[PDB]
């Protein structure tokens, strides 16, 4: 199911509008997903778009059937798992065990920043005592999925 | 629901003391901001109680007896925030939440600030897009409207018309 409004104005440009997040990424391996579904959750169907003014004109001109949360790529701006904190997880589990989740996907360069903000923030792990291990490490304090789609978040 | 119903007759007996109640239940806001407290607030929901001691004998309460789960949050803990509550700065003199909210319970106040924090409240999305987006802070900022930008910088709305349904 793809992402359906009205135009908010006349002469509108489609392309402005990238759709919905689930439609818009490429699993490198298909033995992730299941991580990778529980990693983004409702995120999958936040619709991504070029800006703020863009996200503004569909919320109140686009006649939308939902409630929608819009990712604008102008503005988001998440709060990414550092270098450092990969660094300190693959010495912990070993680097073959941890992932950022966002590695685990491919997706079209112009969405970087969306994408960020959907996989760039949780580890994915490839088992639980390596989940636990990695999310509750007093240095990397982060959320981490499992392959098997077990959530371990600190906060 | 069947939660807080089990929770608020433990307090009325006597039988667990310490209990407050839901958050939301504990202070008051000028109707006009209703639907904005309400869309951006799910921690209104949340069930003070005085201490860690208190919460935990709920959450052993609830699940002995399969009614079910509930937040809690405990006046002990909300201490820090005693030096945290004085107004600040904020773009166009946007109204805080936080400071909308009308308590006499100052331990209260404390678990109000916990839950609105720096959350602002603006006219429409054109101001909210405005406030929120600074350069050097971005703004957690929900509308009369119920829509909301969040410090992440996504917004979300829709459907606002439904917002009054039966």
Same mark, same amino acid.
């Given at each position: 199911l793809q992402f359906a409004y009205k135009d908010?104005?006349?002469?509108?440009?489609?392309?402005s509008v990238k759709g919905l997040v689930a439609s818009l990424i490429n699993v490198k391996?298909?033995?992730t997903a299941t991580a990778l579904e529980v990693v983004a959750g409702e995120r999958l169907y936040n619709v991504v778009v070029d800006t703020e003014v863009t996200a503004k004109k569909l919320l109140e001109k686009?006649? =939308?059937?939902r409630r929608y949360t819009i990712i604008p790529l102008n503005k988001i701006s998440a709060r990414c798992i550092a270098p450092e904190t990969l660094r300190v997880a693959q010495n912990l589990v070993g680097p073959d065990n941890? +992932?950022?989740? =966002?590695?685990l996907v491919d997706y079209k360069p112009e969405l970087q920043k969306g994408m960020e903000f959907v996989f760039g923030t949780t580890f994915v792990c490839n088992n639980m005592d390596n989940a636990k291990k990695v999310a509750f490490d007093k240095r990397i304090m982060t959320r981490t999925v499992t392959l098997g789609g077990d959530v371990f978040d600190p906060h | 629901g069947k939660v807080l119903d089990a929770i608020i007759q433990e307090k009325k007996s006597g039988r667990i003391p310490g209990i407050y109640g839901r958050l939301g239940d504990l202070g008051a806001i000028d109707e006009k901001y209703d639907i904005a407290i309400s869309s951006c607030? +799910?921690? =209104?929901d949340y069930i003070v109680v005085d201490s860690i001691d208190t919460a935990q004998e709920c959450v052993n309460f609830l699940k002995k007896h399969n009614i079910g789960i509930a937040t809690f949050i405990g006046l002990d803990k909300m201490t820090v925030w005693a030096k945290k509550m004085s107004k600040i700065q904020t773009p166009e003199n946007t109204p805080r939440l936080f400071d909308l909210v009308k308590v006499k319970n100052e331990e209260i106040r404390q678990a109000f600030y916990f839950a609105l924090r720096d959350t602002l409240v603006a006219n429409n999305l054109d101001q909210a897009t405005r406030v929120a987006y600074q350069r050097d802070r971005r703004w957690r900022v929900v509308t009369l409207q119920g829509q909301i930008i969040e410090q992440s910088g996504t917004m979300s709305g829709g459907l606002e018309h439904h917002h009054h349904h039966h």
């Open positions: 908010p104005e006349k002469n509108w440009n489609r392309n391996d298909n033995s686009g006649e =939308l059937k941890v +992932h950022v989740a =966002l590695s | 607030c +799910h921690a =209104l």
